Amino acid sequence: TRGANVIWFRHGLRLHDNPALLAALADKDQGIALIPVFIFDGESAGTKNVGYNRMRFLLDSLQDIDDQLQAATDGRGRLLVFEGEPAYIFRRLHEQVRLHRICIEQDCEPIWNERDESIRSLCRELNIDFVEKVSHTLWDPQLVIETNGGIPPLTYQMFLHTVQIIGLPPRPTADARLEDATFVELDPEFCRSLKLFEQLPTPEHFNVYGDNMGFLAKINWRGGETQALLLLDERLKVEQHAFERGFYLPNQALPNIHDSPKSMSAHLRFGCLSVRRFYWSVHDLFKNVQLRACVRGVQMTGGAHITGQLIWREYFYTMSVNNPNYDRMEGNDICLSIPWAKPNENLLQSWRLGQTGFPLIDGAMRQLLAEGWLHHTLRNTVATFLTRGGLWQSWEHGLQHFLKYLLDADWSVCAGNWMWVSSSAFERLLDSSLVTCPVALAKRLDPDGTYIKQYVPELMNVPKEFVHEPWRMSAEQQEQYECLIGVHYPERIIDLSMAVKRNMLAMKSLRNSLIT
Template sequence: MPSTKTVGYNRMRFLLNSLADINSQLQALGNTGGELGKLYLFQGNPTAIFRRLNEHYQLNKICFEQDCEPIWNRRDDSVRALCSELGIEAVEKVSHTLWDPRTVISTNGGIPPLTYQIWREYFYTMSVNNPNYDRMEGNAICLSIPWAKPVADQLQRWRSGHTGFPLIDAAMRQLLAEGWLHHTLRNTVATFLTRGALWQNWEHGLRHFLKYLLDADWSVCAGNWMWVSSSAFERLLDSSLVSCPIAFSKRLDPKGEYIRQYVPELANVPQEYIHEPWRMPQELQERYECLVGVHYPERIVDLAKVSKRNTLAMQALRHSLIAEGAPDEGPPHCRPSNEDEVRQFFWLVD
């Protein structure tokens, strides 16, 4: 089952609300016969549904949007085959992407271009012929980084927003509550899970994002996770460009307003300690009813220690790639992104 079929509450509610809105608009428009319009929904195998509809209504044309992601190829191919069998005209239009990724690849000599002005379209083009794009194994463009073995407690604390780092926790709780995050926060929590702190495989984060983000998109989401984790699409392979969640929090949310909104345990903590509550003296923790380790969790890791460990691991990986001829030769994951682009994307300061 494709991971985009794993739908959380907010995504399902958004989908149902959108369908209800379309139905109400159709009802308001009506039709030439004076009857109310209506949106019909069918659940099940598309070819079986279209075959039964054809038996009752003799379909002349089936129109659908091109879904270029490889996880949907079998479904769409079966619908085209059915249309050919029954003499139904199949009309497939490119609208989800700006261009047909297959045409882009064909025009570029049969390979995806390594330069793009729009990352979204770039990710679609890179994924169109890669059914393993959402995982490390079998994915030719993804580095096989030796991530740590999954630690269930760490993964759950990250997912639920109980890492002990206020900005990370606020962002992860916003995701669960609202199904949305600003792209800088998506990058921050993704970096924290992977090369920035926990050294966990990016696939864990991708599955979580696909389930809870309202705008979750298989190609774009997987592409961003690979890039942020230094698994693909970059030349640097260097974890020195990692945003510290504490320093970034002070710059992004200096008064702690965002943190207080999503982490109520810290609502009464003074601004001086809102980004680092573990620095608050015991007396103040008791006064503001925020005992670290009781009301708010202890830090999940020693950030200074794991950052140094991860930097050394990434440097070792970089040296091994260079020995294999990277970036000009070796693994095909590299994209000629530059440091300025990375800094802009991650909102890093000089």
């Protein structure tokens, strides 16, 4: 037996900046081979409740890894795709070929704690070393907790100081030299007995059927490493336009809706693009745009404002590793028990299917069902319409629906964002400030009404003056323009002005009753 090493892609679906693969590619001179394995256990990579868009994104990314391996190894090496219990597969793989160590990427979320402990107990009882490198995050979340003093940092400014004394996150590592790696061919009988996928399957194989709604996806989303790097060239150009202008974060400085997206959320979550590579490629772009434009009038200042959203994604990761109930309220010591209304399936299905009667909320919710990605402002206005400024429902319903249909469904990030918009856990707690009104925000994100007309196909003849507020359109204009409210486009399911004023009355009462 020559021996073989096992790299498992629970996440971090890439080859560049993979410390797990660097440990996998080590011990070459002894004769230890390499086995790349993906396991479809129904839980890994967010497959418990997965829509057609995210399942295609995972399936397209697996083809890109297989195409990368078949190009560097000229067909000698290929990805192995399985479907079964991970403890059963690794035990049978250890019997055929003697393993040496299983190297993974560290998934810090506690929903993978039961899976990791089962694997950790398996290798310890089989005299197999366990390797768990961390590359999904800039800093180790358990390291931040230990340096803070046994309690996670409960403030963004307190978390920013905690990572200041930790140091800068590490630079991206080298690229794996898979051109000389040893791959082992298995017995074909062992492949059918272990449910090995001889070809890459379809999303219909996992009972995830493509809906008829996805015809109106104006843009197309493609996963994998190759699409992650080509889009990275496009977003850094967007950054360079803002860097020569004097401001940062162009996605939240100039909010553009009716164009191609410039977000590294889907590729970064699945690991098609390394976060550390994304962190440093936009900081080194900021470093040499400060130096060579210092002769010009505009001079930069430096700091962490360039990647201010990446610290936010680590803030939710830090206060979720030790909280197994991070996605709910019962047993959760971070969020209050806000008395939401009784869960109404009629209002929820109207909100989920994009039939609420508000053109921005209808346009945004139909975009998620068709493409799987929204803008951050578009995600905030549909999370405020359901929890605070509107239906007054529980955020757990919106969190579960977001986790099923998002292209970037991160368990710690989405639950943290849903508990911020509802304002139940973090700072600016129980705020009685102005809520995100969809009527006013639609009139200036897309004043022309192009984006609303794109995703709502019932408003072709509706002009730009009436498309944001079709309820102001008269009955005579409704007949001649094919915008009959109630039979073509739904009426507003709730009164927005009455519901907003009612909720802040209950919001102020909770704040007053919080004291004593």
